[PDB]
């Protein structure tokens, strides 16, 4: 239906098949972080029903992302299946793989330049923490061209569960500036609530002290890493699965729903939480470029950690 | 090893996979005879071991050749397997699929223009005779580019058997001009003998009168079709399999070795023959272009049929 979507699927299919033939070494070389693969297709009077007639597909740093997927426990055949067996669904734009495992977000060429800028340090951080992190798990990055339109996409692991539905959803920054959902927003089906909605509506997260301490330790290292790269304006995304409400119309695989945390036994309701850092690709400078048409990366870091520290 | 060979294999693999997704109708449209598919690949600092870094692959009239392969009883998955599972072997240049089913010949852009010129009438002739013909069975036509070198290839069904080895081999034109193998040639391992070697060495083909009559009827229609398109300078290729000599160091599947004809029961030796027309792409004009640096297409036709008429 959507031609840019068909190119992406075609492109991912192609990219994984190509890599299935490559010998994968344990390590990445400096060149791998500068590598890419380009395919340009021209069909004249042929294959009109499936694909656009003229398109380009570019994959950035294929070896680095192949390395990352494995580190994040993701098999290439499964990634391929999730993205190609049936179209991703819409809901900048984002799409979800038909099986709800992966998110595909459309980003700017500026975002792509920034991703390239941090990719090596991101990778080393992922190595250092053995892939145990609240940061986005970046799984692939592509450029799509279909006759006049060029778009860039990044693929991440879904923060939420692929099985367990989320009934309530928060986006927290811990900003001094008043963050609150709009009244038009508060009436969307699955709204995206913000910092005020949390402080105001006395939302509680019922997790035991061991899960709480582990979470905040992870969070601390992650946010310090982000501050260090002068990145800011990211959020904690928090989703809540109500086991009772799901039975009306609750265990999860922690190897697929990696961000899940069960509630403790004294929780007022049987709840599963999914919490992760999202939206990291705003460099201090790029935020100023969107503002033109007082708090820095270091401040943002502390503000963020205090707030999350308080709410759990 | 040979990069042009790797591109071809990669290209055929790609082409068949693409077509596996297309809905194949029973008929071809006029546009199908003008169609093509182009892929241009650029790998920067990636995948150096398997493939050249920069290459192009073009497939001419993919739907027509998909239609032809099925008409000639060839499944797309098998064609793909034969051409990609292991490299074709060398022996203008020609190559043989590792399983000996298909021949890959390198041809000029002039040959490609001529193939395009007759492709539609070739196809209609193949329809008319239900694929029962001594003409080459054209299965695919491609253009390969690897950094500075451009080559064109055509794929045909092997005249000879994929199982049964050929010990003697003739190329017959029935020309008034003296055709004979060279004395340097006559000492090659599996030499390519010609018209004189046949008349001179009293070669006999021991086939019964029913097989003989059927063969010559086919031959007659085929050569008339060729004369009609002003094509000439083609040969009858004749290969002989000696069942005895093959046991020293003999039935065949007529659905794979389609050009095979068993000897009759009174043959001095247990022999299988493989006979077919080859090398059809010389148009009257193109032969004159190679001669510059008396007999026409109609004459050639008669000369050819008389000679083959005499030798069986």
UniProtKB/Swiss-Prot annotation, chains A, B:
Phosphorylated in tyrosines. Phosphorylation is induced by light and increases kinase activity. Expressed ubiquitously, with high levels in the brain. Present in most tissues, except notably skeletal muscle and small intestine. In rod outer segments, activated by light. Inhibited by I-OMe tyrphostin AG-538 (I-OMe-AG-538), acting as an ATP-competitive inhibitor. One of its GO terms (cellular component) is lysosome. It comes from the Eukaryota. Residues 1-312 form the PIPK domain. Its EC number is 2.7.1.149. GO terms for biological process: 1-phosphatidyl-1D-myo-inositol 4,5-bisphosphate biosynthetic process; autophagosome-lysosome fusion; megakaryocyte development; negative regulation of insulin receptor signaling pathway; phosphatidylinositol phosphate biosynthetic process; positive regulation of autophagosome assembly; regulation of autophagy; vesicle-mediated cholesterol transport. One of its GO terms (molecular function) is ATP binding. It catalyses: a 1,2-diacyl-sn-glycero-3-phospho-(1D-myo-inositol-5-phosphate) + ATP = a 1,2-diacyl-sn-glycero-3-phospho-(1D-myo-inositol-4,5-bisphosphate) + ADP + H(+); 1,2-dihexadecanoyl-sn-glycero-3-phospho-(1D-myo-inositol-5-phosphate) + ATP = 1,2-dihexadecanoyl-sn-glycero-3-phospho-(1D-myo-inositol-4,5-bisphosphate) + ADP + H(+); 1,2-dihexadecanoyl-sn-glycero-3-phospho-(1D-myo-inositol-5-phosphate) + GTP = 1,2-dihexadecanoyl-sn-glycero-3-phospho-(1D-myo-inositol-4,5-bisphosphate) + GDP + H(+). The modification N6-acetyllysine is found at residues 56, 105. InterPro entries: PInositol-4-P-4/5-kinase_C_sf, PInositol-4-P-4/5-kinase_core, PInositol-4-P-5-kinase_N, PInositol-4/5-P-5/4-kinase. It is found in: Cell membrane; Nucleus; Lysosome; Cytoplasm. Residues 26-32 are annotated as: Required for interaction with PIP5K1A. SUPFAM superfamilies: SAICAR synthase-like. It is an enzyme of class 2 (transferase). Keywords: Acetylation, ATP-binding, Cell membrane, Cell projection, Cytoplasm, Kinase, Lipid metabolism, Lysosome, Membrane, Nucleotide-binding, Nucleus, Phosphoprotein, Transferase. PANTHER family: PHOSPHATIDYLINOSITOL 5-PHOSPHATE 4-KINASE TYPE-2 ALPHA, PHOSPHATIDYLINOSITOL-4-PHOSPHATE 5-KINASE. Catalyzes the phosphorylation of phosphatidylinositol 5-phosphate (PtdIns5P) on the fourth hydroxyl of the myo-inositol ring, to form phosphatidylinositol 4,5-bisphosphate (PtdIns(4,5)P2). Has both ATP- and GTP-dependent kinase activities. May exert its function by regulating the levels of PtdIns5P, which functions in the cytosol by increasing AKT activity and in the nucleus signals through ING2. May regulate the pool of cytosolic PtdIns5P in response to the activation of tyrosine phosphorylation. Homodimer. Interacts with PIP4K2B; the interaction may regulate localization to the nucleus. Probably interacts with PIP5K1A; the interaction inhibits PIP5K1A kinase activity. This is Phosphatidylinositol 5-phosphate 4-kinase type-2 alpha. The gene is PIP4K2A.
């Amino acid at each position: 239906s959507d031609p840019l979507l068909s190119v992406l699927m075609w492109g991912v299919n192609h990219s994984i098949n190509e890599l299935s033939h490559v010998q994968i070494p344990v390590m990445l070389m400096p060149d791998d972080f500068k590598a890419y693969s380009k395919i340009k297709v021209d069909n004249h009077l042929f294959n009109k029903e499936n694909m656009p007639s003229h398109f380009k597909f570019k994959e950035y740093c294929p070896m680095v992302f192949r390395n990352l997927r494995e580190r994040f426990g993701i098999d290439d055949q499964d990634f391929q299946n999730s993205l190609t067996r049936s179209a991703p669904l819409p809901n900048a734009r984002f799409h979800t793989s038909y099986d709800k495992r992966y998110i595909i977000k459309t980003i700017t060429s500026e975002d792509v330049a920034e991703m390239h800028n941090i990719l090596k340090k991101y990778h080393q951080y992922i190595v250092e923490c053995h892939g145990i992190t609240l940061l986005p798990q970046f799984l692939g990055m592509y450029r799509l061209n279909v006759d006049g339109v060029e778009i860039y996409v990044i693929v991440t692991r879904n923060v939420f569960s692929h099985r367990l539905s989320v009934y309530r959803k928060y986006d927290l920054k811990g900003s001094t500036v008043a963050r609150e959902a709009s009244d038009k927003e508060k009436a969307k089906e699955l709204p995206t609530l913000k910092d005020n909605d949390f402080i105001n509506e006395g939302q509680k997260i019922y997790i035991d002290d061991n899960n709480k301490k582990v979470f905040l330790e992870k969070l601390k290292k992650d946010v310090e890493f982000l501050a260090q790269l002068k990145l800011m304006d990211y959020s904690l995304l928090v989703g809540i699965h109500d086991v009772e409400r799901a039975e009306q119309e609750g265990e999860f695989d922690p190897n697929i729903d990696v961000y899940g945390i069960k509630c403790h036994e004294n929780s007022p309701r049987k709840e599963v939480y999914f919490m992760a850092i999202i939206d990291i690709l705003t460099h201090y400078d790029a935020k100023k470029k969107a503002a033109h048409a007082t708090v820095n990366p270091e401040q943002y870091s502390k503000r963020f950690l205090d707030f999350i520290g308080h709410i759990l």
